[PDB]
Structure formats: structure tokens, C-alpha cells
Symmetry: D3
Subunit: 293 residues, 6 copies
């Protein structure tokens, strides 16, 4: 089973690996098929799932909720994370992509999330992106309302700089439970730009997205000779695949990230979860870093 | 007319818009013409005015003082902000442009400002630029003397990074009342680099300079189709001019900036002030941002 | 009188200083007032004037043509340059700013320019900006048509890289007569990036726009201590103003630029034309360069 | 079905779209399944195919050759492009990834390619990457031997700068037939950096790789609202998928690129090919560019 | 003689100028010649010396300890600073250069340092470079153990960003006593990027390395015209040499850096210490800055 | 002995390694000691020597000419390269560093060079740096005059972009014989920015300066771990020193550079020339590249 992990002080207990549903609509699953898939990754210990209001042209939440309506007993076994803050052109009233982080929008988005997902509470709500118009007082008013009514148990952010993180935190009487950020051998700036230093310092563990380079590792022909060094290291470790090596690479980070898995096929999930057992050496970790840069 | 605003905790009360006098020598006004102009913007509710020792080759403060000696009753109605820290070659001793932030210079500069402006106090004194040779103990000692003697009511900085700001603040018994910074659709890095994040967190409102791009919006042929998108949004808001839309764009920031007006023509001042009544939508705000980038 | 200058091999004879009309609508002139202004700068030897289809929300060409209709004898004494290639949102069918460099648009734009300016020929037509969709074959087809019909006597470009310049040139049986580019102490990259090297090499003289920093020199408070070094040098040369020093700085360049003047007030034009008589030293030229960088 | 195109002066005739086999080992196809796939895209008019010695840990060429030995009649219907120049650690001799562009390596690589692909000629051989140790005389000697012997019909390069291209071309009696380069809404610098300017000038059409962003368009959560603007334009064009709109975006370039398709699923190939019939407006093209930036 | 300075709150007392020994192996000194050199800079007031486990291919520490063994009275007269955290290919087991900041490596490195330098305590131990794999709890455990046993008196870092500095500091019950960083007219980003602001704010003085541009000032043809602008300002100050001017320029910084001297020539050390008496004005400082950038 | 090479079409024949004299004043040589040093590198086959009007505060040329005056037979045995175009504050009339590339200054500079070096001709004259005020017609006039009179045999440039190079070349009836540029594992942008591509294309060989990183390789603490990766490859090649490895790395470039040696120690010159016989493989070259970048 996947390890159980407290992601922040007084924060929730998650599974170390998180199941990401941002691509759910591309998997072409029925509600019944989705139920089986959730049941499958639950049995492997992946209990924490990641959503957002905008995913799938604003349809993934609703589609996930249809599965939860078929199998009502699953809710209790899951930790549901979702997000708000982004406005895309998938909605007709949005003439251009932008951000909305006003109090009322946050409350309305969360409430809609509850309806879509067919549940009466969210485990965590995140601000999806840092908004130049973000009024921390107003976000705090929304969070306080959602918290005191029992509709949202924890709050965090996504893709925030440390200064943006500290601004919002300064308004809240509880700890921001995460800062969901992009971490992989393909995208390493947060390792040294201060983001991951801050998170380690506050003992807040990031949920890590785009762990496989946002598709570049396998589909960007320019990383093909890089696939090779992960292969060479894979065989040193007797790892079954290069994905396991990349996940191990991420887990090795001292901020102790929780990797988000995005594949809608189950033993690529299982393959991912085998990274918990690979002991990377430092030289193997740095060999990967340099092969990628 | 123009709103009254407290710019910081334990800070002064300023007008939301600030009249900037850095171009005063270029306006070719008699002392009596300048007296009429001050009275005119005072009647509109613009009471805060912005000076620096160096402006106009060290001439603008003295010119303003000529007006105040002719009309002594004006001083009590104004909040005078001036600065020190830059040394230009308009003075023979300065063989190159550089910075000077030593304790004695600050005090002597403030004292000369009083003499120039024909007043016995300043509402606020700013360090004009961050100086790599800035000793914060030295600045603090200067500020402390100016404060206890009643010569200067409040202190702030200009164009400081968050680290430079924190450094000086650490030495001071009172709160720095502002960080005067460049903010416009043409110059946006401070929106995301942490400068405005820190000011919002501390509830310190920045005075905003180069609000119209330091001349570029109207005089740079390259921004001329951009000037056209502001015209399109102006027509939507039924605004009489595009500068109104720009000022509304800045006011919309959650750090709540106080824009500095630099025009010596009173109808351009009045035109600016109707920005307070403009209802800029988020989408309009982001369209402006995108068109400028 | 202003010097007469051949700007390219087999190219037209221009005045060394060019009168720019991109801001004509902001000057608030009647047709009668504009006539007087043209007559005034003509008598000083400024015969070459610069237009574009998009200027003034597509109105400057027409406004200039009204003056030419009042005083028909002026056409013969002027060299008219205009441009096409940019599409702005000042026209309702343009939902966003973009470029159009298709054959038919170029021909139609030129033909409209002839109607607006109330004349039967243009001295030079320029591609206003380098378009990623630019098909050099199609531009060449348009130029050939306009040339062989006698509607346009010469052709050039604006803001092109040397590779973009060479691409278009490779299609044309005559020499591109200029590459209109931004040159000033405030914007110096073209001095070393290869643009001005290419122009000198081909003996093609650039028309230089934004010569005074697109408004920054006088209106960007951050260049105020830089105004000072131009002042110090102005007095060494006994120059009447800093504009004359900046123009002299530009004229000193070995690509031998033709500065475009944009002020609608006549002895700032006259003041500009006095730069022909200032002999800058190299040390003065480099002192300016370093004061600006 | 797919248009026939001559890619350069004295160059070969290719299909407008190219089938890329760099992912072939990941498709898990039997030799007979691969034979069916080749026949399927041949029937759609896709005849040009793209290989490299290194692809799939030096396995994709040989796998393709298994198909050609089973179906010998196919070779005459195909144009085979392959490459050399990169040395990866999938071979034991290579202790680090590097480049090898020495004369003997090029010849031996081309010869191994023939053996791998079970054919006695290649339609085109490319240098895979610009090598700081590239001696253009050495490459030229290799190309000359391969050409005179009839083993290779044409020669080109991949990812070269205009200076690297010019350098190699200077040594060759025949024209380099392509510069295979990365082009997509996600990666646009080549549009303006001179690479595509030079190819259009020489009337050489580039083969375009990573047309869909090297996986980012669909697998990078960060481009997911961007994926939505392509959906909006798709609906305007009544296109069945967004990749069609992307391919139409690339085809719209005046260098006239030949996009490389990398999907081993035949219906994704067919979906791509209907891009030829799509009428992309300039405004649509620029909206896509802006939404990606 | 060289002024003595408290480098941090609760921190040790160092000499304002620091003798750096990273180039020791290249000087080709016998152990006896090294004794004399140490005694000579000691006489001038230079008591603080800077080492690292990796210097000279893991050889410089041991070469220094041979001198200390011949002259054991010198030990008490010195403040010895050393470092760990970098792994170089001078050790066969390291197939590539990388970082090691685990607890047991830090402890074992410090203990090897003690054996190499032939002494039972270090005055200060530094983390040589920020390691993306740095676990601050682990470093704190190591530092705690070394402090508990008397083996190491004070602790600091080298080349840390302010966020890396704050991270490590959060775990420690004692103040980090320095952040050793690169400062010269040739390399100025730390003047404005927050590194030196943080140090001034915390009243922690940095040790400054590559004070003369890492060799470039004298050995890079491209700085020869700049070198000559330093000579003009030298003449104005009646300074014996341009090294004095550069050191004076660094000392003028309000973080109050301690310059590390790396020359094995006592003549040049002496010429460094004379910078303490130089009256560098603001315009001279700024003229220097600009000559170096091109401003 | 050092191979001889034709540096350009119609160009002069140089030694593959070039003795650079920009640091001459710092060596503290008497004129007689300089004679011996010249004779010693001459014996090893180093015949081409590199000077500039500005070097050593406008002193190095004249110091060299004093040696040539004591030993006038040496002149014919050397190819002398010098430069003009830079104005430094070592001359009182220059209140700031800048460039001067006007016709009469070029002519007067070359003529001063002749007087300084105590010789009646220069083998090659270079424009030292690209000048934004460079008027190529003016330079061509100067070069024409100097060529017409026999005072200068060949012409080239230093630190030019390819567009600056092409600009000047367009005006000249003879081929520019070199573009002297910076090349080292420490400074690699010219490998891929088109500078070296253009030179290879035109079959013009660059003279390479700052081959050892302008002092950084040895004097910058931050390259000490890299210095040690060069030592690993040295051992693999049985190379006496890492300087040999670096020179071999530069020689491997297909533009076929001529390295400028700047050491006044004949021991180190000798150790440079041994690079000609080193078998640097591709993987070794690339390992070096990557150790220097961090790739």
C-alpha cells in the first residue's frame, strides 16, 4: 500500500501519491468504468484525488461526481482536492482567459464543486494560480466562510511564489496546507529559486504536478537521448520502467513532494507506486539532474 | 472630489491622487501662476504633492517655495513629500551621477528642502533610490533626528526591493509609510516580483510613478496601436480619455496605489480624477494587460 | 537649409531631417493651420514627410491630404513616405491587432494612401513591421505592380532584422531604399546587433524613429539625472538645448541616419535642425552612450 | 489525399505530411501490424517517412526494416529520410551523450541504416544536430561518397542555425534539401530568428517536428486553457479536432513546412490530413499565436 | 596590525582580513616554509585562516596540519575555518562532481578535518555550497553533535541565497556566523540581489572570496583598460597598488565584509592590509563600480 | 617544433602557437632577459608574437622594441602582430575609456607601433575591438595607405561579430587574415553563435585569447572542482599538465585556432606546445565541455 502522509502542520492525511483527474475527459470512460478505476487505485492505497473547476472544459468534476453517485460508499475513503481562480474561454461569458479571486467567486466555485462532485464537503480547496488582482483579505473572507460552515476542511495554493504565499498566509488563522507546484527533471527552477526552501522550512509538502515533464519525456523527440540515461539508471536499480526512476527522483527531494499521477491506465499507476521502494543514490540523483539540464 | 487615504499603519492621510512636480521647470510658470495652479488642484481635492531635491537640476523645490511665500496659507492644506539620495552632475562637486545615503547628507538635504520650500516641516521624506552603500543604521539615525525635532513627520522609500525595504525597516521604531514605485500597463514586473505583494501584506500603499509609461503611451509610436485598445475600452466605459482608463487600471490593484499626476495643465489633472468613478471589470483589466505585453 | 541626401543607391533624394506626422491628430490643427506648418518646415528645408495608414486611428493621411487640397502647389516640393502592414482595432473588422502583408492588401492600402493624401503618386512605401506570415514573393508582386504603374517610386521596410531585409531584397529587381528603425541614446541595441552594420554595408541610410526615446528623455522621471549629462555636454558645445545634442549623437553614427522629427511646434523643429552644425567629439559621443546605458 | 511537394531546388518530391517513426518501439506493433499501418498511411497519400539511427535506443530503423522485408513492394512507394550525428549511451561505447560528425561515422551510419531498413538506398540523409566539432569539409566528403555511389539521393540538416547551414552548404555541389526544425504554437522563436527567413529565401521547405508541442498541448496542464482557445477556433472552422487547427497553423507559414506526424494510430493520422482543407484566417492565426505566448 | 572583528552576534572574533589556503598546493612550499609564512601573516595580525576538505584535491588541509605539527604553539593563535558539502572527482568513488550534505558525511568530514589539520577543534565549519538535496534537519543534527562535543565552535554557510540561509537558520539554536560569498568590482550581483541586505540586517559579516575577480583583473586581457582606471584612482589615493584600491572598495560595503587573501606571497599580503587606511570616497567607489560594468 | 600554418587565403604564415605580450610589464624583465626569452620561444618554433598599442599602459610595444634593438637579427625571424582602436585612461587626454577608429588615428597608431617596436614594417595590424562609430570606408583608406607603403603586410580584426566582419571586409581589396577571439572551456559562446562558423567557412583561422579562462581556471576557487576533472582527463592522456589538455581542447575545434600563450615563463610555453601531440577523443572533448558548463 501507498504510505500515509500528513502534508502540513494540522493539515490532512493524504496518500503520498495523488491521482490527478485533469485529463479525465480524454480517457473516454463511462461512469461505471470510472467507478472501477477509482476502486482499483483505492485498493493500491491512492486515496487522494486532484481536481479543479476548469478541468475538461469545466466537466471533469461533474463526471467524477457521477461515479460517486453510483458508488456512494467511496466518498469516505477519498480525500478530494479541488481548485478555483482561473476563468477560461470554455465558458461563453469569459471573452478571454483570466483570473478571478474575489470572495463571492471563490465561495460560489466551491459550492458548485460540492454539487458537481456530489458531496457535502471538500478536503482541500486551492487557489489555482497567483492573480495580480489577488486581494488576500477577500480570499481570507471566503476561506473563513467555507471553513466555519464545514464545507471545506483545509486550504492551500498552487504555483505561488514565496512572497505570494506569505501574503495570503498572513491573513489566515490556520496553516496553508500546500503549494502545488511543477517539479521534474525537465523543470527544475523551484529547486533553487526559493519555493521549495520555503516549503521545507514551514514543513509543508508540495503536491507536484507535471512530474513527467508535461509530456515531453516521452513525446518530445528532443528528450529521446535523455530517456536513455533514465534507462541506464533504471537498470542499475532494476526498476521496471523509467517513470519509476523519475518519481523516485522527485521523492528524494527534501521538501518531500507528493507526486500527482495523471494516467487513466491502472498499472501505469501501479508502476508509479513502485518508486517508493527504489533507493536512489546521490550520484544517481545528480546524474539525472545533469542529463536533463 | 478626490478621496482621502491613510497610506500606512500610523501613517499620514493623503489624497488618493498625488500632484508630482518633477517637470515644474519645464512648465515655465511664474510664482503667481503656480499659486493659481496649486489652488486649482487643491479645490479638486488633490492635496498631496511630490518633490525631490534633484528635480529640475535642483530647482523645482525652490520654485515651489516661491509660491508658498506668496501664499503662506497654502502650506497647512498640503502634504509635502520630498526625497534625497541621488547626486547629479547639475552640482559642480558631483563629477559623476551617484548615490549618497550617509547620515549627514540626509539631514542637510532635508534641511535644504525646508529652506527651499519655505516651510518648517515636511510631511514625508523618502530615500530616492536603493544605494548599494546604504548603511541602514546611518539612515535610521538621520530619520530619528529629523523625527524628534519635528522637521519631518513620516519616512518612506522609493524603488526599493522587498529585501532593501525590510533592511531599513528593521532599524526604525516607526513604520515606513510608502515605497514609491513605477506602475503602469507599460511597466508591470512589480505586480508579480514581490514588491506589491509585500506592500499589500504590510498594508502600506505605494505612490505610483510613470503611470502613463514615462511618456511612451502617447510619444512612442510603438505603443500607438496599444493606445487604440485603451480607446476601445474607454468607449465601453464612456470615459472621456484614455488616461482615465489607465489610472483606473492602476487603482484596481489590491495594493491600492496612489497615482502621481505629472501634468502642469489643470484640465489634464481633472480628467485624471474622474478615474475614481470608473468601473473597470476584471476582463477589461486583463485585456489592457495583454494588449500592453 | 537642411542638407539634401540620397538615402540609397538609385534611391530618392530626401532632406536629412524628416518631418513625422504620426501625432498629427494630437496637435489639434485645422487644415489651414497645417498648411502654414508645412510651409514653415519647407522653408527650413524639411521636404521629406513620414506617414502610415494606421496613424491617428487611420486619420492622419486624410488630414494631411486636406492641407494638400487647400495648397496644391506643395505636393511637388515634398517627398511623401507612407507605410502599410499593420492592422489595428481602430477598424471594426480587426478584432485584434495583427499584420497583413498579402499582395492585394498592400496594393489596396497604397491606393487608399493616394486618395487620402490627395496625390497621384507616393515617393516611398514601406512595410511597417516584419510579419511572421510575410510571403516575400507576394510583397514583390505588389511592389512591382505599384512601381510599373507609376503609383510608387521607391520601396523600403521598417523595423526589419537583417535576415528579414535580405529575404525581401532577394525578390526585388531594385534596391530597398531604407530600413526605418529605432535609434537613440535610450535604445541602442541596433548599434551592435547587426542592423546598422548591414545598412552601412549596403550604403542604405536608415530613417530613425523615436529619436528622443519615445518620450522617456523628457517624461520618464528616471531619465531626469540623464537629462543632466546631455545638459553638461550641451554647454560644452554651446548648444541651445539637449534635443540638439541627441540629434547630433544620432547623426554621428556611420550608417548616417535621417532623424524623424515628431513635434508639431515649429521652432522645436528649428531647434532640431541646428544639430547639423554641432561637431560632437568621440569622447562626448561615448559619454552620452554610457550615461544612458 | 495528401499533396505532393518538391522540397527544394533540384530536391525530391515528398508528401506534404511526413510520418515520423521515432516513437515506433512504444507502439508495440508486430512487423505485420506495421506493414498494415504503412499501407494505411500510403493509401492516404502519406509517402515520406522519418527515421534516425538513434531512435528507440537504435531500434526503430531495424523494426521498420522487418516490415519492408515482409513487404518488399513498399520501398518504391516510400521516401525514406533518416539521420546521423548523435551518439547516445544506449550504445556501450558511448559513456556520455555527445555528437559525432566525422566523415567515417557518417558513411558507416548511412550504411548501417541501409542494412537496418532492408533497402539499398535512402532518399535523404540529415545531420541530426549542429555539432560544435563539425568540420564541413568532412561532412561534404562523406556526402559526396554517399551520393556518387547512389546510396543516398539527397542531403539536409536538422536544427541548424542559418550560419551553420550556410557553412555546410558552401562545401556542397548540390543544394541541401531541408533544415528539419521545431515549429508549433508552443515553440515559435524560429518564426523571427532568421531560420525560417533563410529557408523561404532559398525556397527550401523545412520538415517540422514537435508540431503539437512535444506532448505539452495535451499533457501539460499549463496549456489546458490554451487547448481551449484552439477548441474555440476549431468550432469556428467546423474542424473535428484541435490538432487539425494546429497543423493548419503550421501550413500557413510562408516557408511552407512539411509537418511530421508522430502518432501510431491511423485515425489520428487521417485527422491530421484534413488540415489541408482548413481555411485559417490571418486573425485566427494571430489569435492562436497570442493565446500560446 | 589588522583590526579584529566580531563577525556575528554570539559569533567568534576574527581578523578583518582572512588568509585563504585553497591555492596552497600550487605555492610549492615545504612544511617549514609554510610555518614561516603563517608566522609572518600572524605577525601582521592575520589570525583567521580559510580551508575546505576539497581544496587541492583533498590535500591542502593535511599540508597545513604538517606545519601545525612542526609548530604546535601556532594553533591557539589561529581561528581555523573549514568547509564540507562538495564531492569532486579527485576521489575515485565520485564519478561526477556533486554535493553531499547528509548528517554522517558532515560529521565524518569535520572529523577528517581535525585529523588533517592536526588539531582537536575547529573554530568554524561551513556548508560549502547550497545543495538542492539539503535537508536542514539533518545538517542541524550534525552541527548539534559537533557543537556538543567541542569539536566545532561555530557554524556558517557559503554561497547561500537568503532563502537557503533562512531555511538552515530556522533549525539551529545558535546564529549562523557567516555566509561566505563572492564580491568584487568584477562580480557585483550580490550588492543588490538581497544577499548582502540580509547579512547587514542580521548584523552578520560575510567572508568575501574572489576579491580580485578570480584572476581576471590581472590575467584577463579584457580587463586591462579597467585595471588602468583602478591605477588612476590609486594615484589619486597615493595607493601603492591597485589591489589596495579593490580591497578598499570591498571594505566600503555596509555589510562590512572580511576579504579572503589567497596569495602565498607575504609581500602581497602586506600590500593587502594597507587597504584598511585608504580613504575611498563615494565618487571613487562609484567610478570603480562603473568602470567595471560599463554603466 | 611548432607547426607553421597559413592563417587565411593569401594570408601570412604563422606559428600555430602565438606568444602574447600583453602582460610583459608585469614580468619585470630587463631588455636583455627579454632577448633571451624571445630567442628561447623562437627555438621552440614560436615565431608569431601578439602586441597592441594599449598593452601595459602604452608601454609593452616599446619594451619589446628595446629587445629588438639589442638583437636586430631577431626581427626577420618574427611575425609581429599589433592592434589599435582602443583609447584608455592611461593617456591623460582620454577622460574615459572609448574607441577610436578614424583614418588618421589608425595611421598614426601604426606609425607609433613601428617606432616603438623599432622596425620598419608590421606583419599584421588588427582593429582591436568593434566600434559602433566604425566607418568601414575610413578604416579601408587607412589600411590601403599602410599597405601601399609597405608599413603593414596584412590586416585583421579582433572580437568582431560576423556582421561587423563582413562590413569591413566588403571595403577591402585583400582578405582579412584573422578575427582574434576569446575561446576556452570557460567561455564557449563563439562555438555556436556563428563567429567560428563564419571563420571556418571563409577558411580564416582565428587567433584565440584567454585560452585558460582569463586566469579563472587556476585563480578562481569556483573552478577548482572543474580543474580536477581536467586532471582526470590529463591522467588518461598521460599529459604532463592540465594546460596541455585545455590547449588540445581548443586545437580540436574545426576553425583550427592559433592559441595565444601569455606566460613569461619558458617552462610553461614548452608545456603548451606539447598539446600538438595530444590525442583528445570526442568523448574527452565533450566531457570537458560539460564539466565547464554543468550541462
Amino acid at each position: 500500500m501507498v504510505q500515509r502522509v500528513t502534508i502540513a502542520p494540522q493539515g490532512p492525511e493524504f496518500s503520498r501519491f495523488v491521482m490527478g483527474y485533469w485529463r479525465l475527459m480524454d480517457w473516454n470512460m463511462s461512469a461505471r468504468q470510472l467507478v472501477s478505476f477509482i476502486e482499483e487505485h483505492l485498493d493500491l492505497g491512492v486515496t487522494t484525488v486532484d481536481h479543479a473547476d476548469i478541468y475538461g472544459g469545466y466537466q471533469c468534476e461533474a463526471a467524477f461526481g457521477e461515479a460517486l453517485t453510483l458508488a456512494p460508499h467511496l466518498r469516505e475513503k477519498l480525500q478530494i482536492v479541488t481548485k478555483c481562480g482561473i476563468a477560461t474561454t470554455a465558458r461563453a461569458e469569459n471573452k478571454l482567459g483570466h483570473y478571478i479571486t474575489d470572495r463571492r467567486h471563490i465561495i460560489l466555485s466551491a459550492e458548485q464543486s460540492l454539487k458537481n462532485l456530489a458531496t457535502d464537503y471538500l478536503d482541500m480547496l486551492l487557489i489555482h494560480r497567483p492573480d495580480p488582482l489577488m486581494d488576500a483579505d477577500d480570499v481570507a473572507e471566503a476561506f473563513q466562510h467555507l471553513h466555519q460552515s464545514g464545507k471545506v476542511r483545509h486550504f492551500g495554493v498552487s504555483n505561488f511564489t514565496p512572497a505570494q504565499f506569505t501574503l495570503l498566509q498572513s491573513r489566515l488563522p490556520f496553516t496553508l496546507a500546500t503549494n502545488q507546484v511543477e517539479i521534474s527533471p525537465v523543470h527544475q527552477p523551484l529547486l533553487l529559486d526559493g519555493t521549495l526552501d520555503q516549503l521545507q522550512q514551514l514543513r509543508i509538502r508540495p503536491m507536484a504536478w507535471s512530474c513527467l515533464g508535461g509530456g515531453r519525456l516521452f513525446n518530445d523527440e528532443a528528450y529521446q537521448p535523455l530517456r536513455q540515461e533514465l534507462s541506464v539508471i533504471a537498470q542499475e536499480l532494476n526498476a521496471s520502467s523509467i517513470e519509476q526512476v523519475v518519481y523516485a527522483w522527485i521523492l528524494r527531494l527534501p521538501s518531500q513532494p507528493l507526486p500527482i499521477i495523471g494516467s487513466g491506465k491502472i498499472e501505469r499507476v501501479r508502476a508509479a507506486l513502485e518508486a517508493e521502494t527504489l533507493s536512489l543514490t546521490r550520484q544517481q540523483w545528480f546524474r539525472i539532474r545533469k542529463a536533463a539540464l
